[PDB]
Each structure stands twice: as C-alpha cells, then as structure tokens.
Design an enzyme around this catalytic site. Sequence first.
Site, PDB file in Angstrom:
ATOM      1  CD  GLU A 160      -2.960  -1.038   0.127  1.00  0.00           C
ATOM      2  OE1 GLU A 160      -3.298   0.399  -0.652  1.00  0.00           O
ATOM      3  OE2 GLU A 160      -3.746  -2.011  -0.318  1.00  0.00           O
ATOM      4  CG  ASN A 176      -8.961   7.291  -4.219  1.00  0.00           C
ATOM      5  OD1 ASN A 176      -7.452   7.266  -3.655  1.00  0.00           O
ATOM      6  ND2 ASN A 176      -9.334   6.168  -3.484  1.00  0.00           N
ATOM      7  CG  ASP A 191     -14.734   8.982  -4.466  1.00  0.00           C
ATOM      8  OD1 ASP A 191     -13.242   8.879  -4.417  1.00  0.00           O
ATOM      9  OD2 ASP A 191     -14.872   7.371  -3.752  1.00  0.00           O
ATOM     10  CB  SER A 220     -11.990   9.542  -1.275  1.00  0.00           C
ATOM     11  OG  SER A 220     -11.873   8.424  -2.102  1.00  0.00           O
ATOM     12  CG  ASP A 224      -6.631   5.551  -1.309  1.00  0.00           C
ATOM     13  OD1 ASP A 224      -8.039   5.561  -0.234  1.00  0.00           O
ATOM     14  OD2 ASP A 224      -6.488   5.505  -2.184  1.00  0.00           O
ATOM     15  CG  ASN A 240     -11.178   5.998   0.354  1.00  0.00           C
ATOM     16  OD1 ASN A 240     -12.291   6.703   0.496  1.00  0.00           O
ATOM     17  ND2 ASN A 240     -11.010   6.434  -0.515  1.00  0.00           N
ATOM     18  CG  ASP A 250     -17.218  -2.720   7.088  1.00  0.00           C
ATOM     19  OD1 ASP A 250     -18.424  -1.877   7.734  1.00  0.00           O
ATOM     20  OD2 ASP A 250     -17.303  -1.800   5.893  1.00  0.00           O
TER      21      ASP A 250
END
Length: 129
Positions: free
Chosen positions: A35, A46, A48, A50, A52, A59, A101
């Site tokens: 990562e 990103n 959208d 967002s 990271d 995110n 999650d």
Amino acid sequence: KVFGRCELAAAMKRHGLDNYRGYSLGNWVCAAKFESNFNTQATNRNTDGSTDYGILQINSRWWCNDGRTPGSRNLCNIPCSALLSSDITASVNCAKKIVSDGNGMNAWVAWRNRCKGTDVQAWIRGCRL
C-alpha cells in the site's frame, strides 16, 4: 516516516495486530509494503474526491475526516491527518475497524494483488520477534 520491515512488524505486534481477527502479522506487514512502501506519509487522491492516507492507505470517504470528501462518515473518529503521523496508533486502530467491516483484508487492494494467496510469513522472516 519510512519504517524498516521488522521495525514495522514490531510496532504492529506492540499494537495488537498479530492474529487480529485471524490475520497473521505477515499479512499486515505485506499490506503496508504494497500500500505505502512502509511510508507513514503516503497519500493518493481518488477520482471520486476521496483520498487514501498513511501506511495502510485508508480512504477518507468512510474512515476519517479530511474536511472535503462529500458524504464523509468518519467511521474511525479521526482527522485523516492522524493517519500520516510517525506514530502508527491511529492507522492500527482504524485498520482494526476496517478489517471487521465484512470484507476482511480484501479492503486493501494492494494486499489483494500482492499478498493474498502467498506465504506472507516471509514478511516476518528474520524478525525473530
């Protein structure tokens, strides 16, 4: 901060990640390698809107507050800026929530692409913690 492999392994172990929800320490070290290249300051915007953040590239749409992600939920109850510290406490705590999650470690794309299905024990080889 850029961690050494076994340095990060030790810090993750001290924060209770080894075998957390059944995911061995080697999985967590592997995920951080691909990562972020073990860099606490790693970031990625990103398409959208967002972003990271940090050693596990968590995110901002769901997990932390950056001020500017539309529909931001802040499920880890932290400023995204906390995931960029040299102190991995905030990243570890939020990662525990993420891995619980309902998608396990599949929540981390680099883990799926580079760690999943491999002998991730190799990531703690030579650490002899």
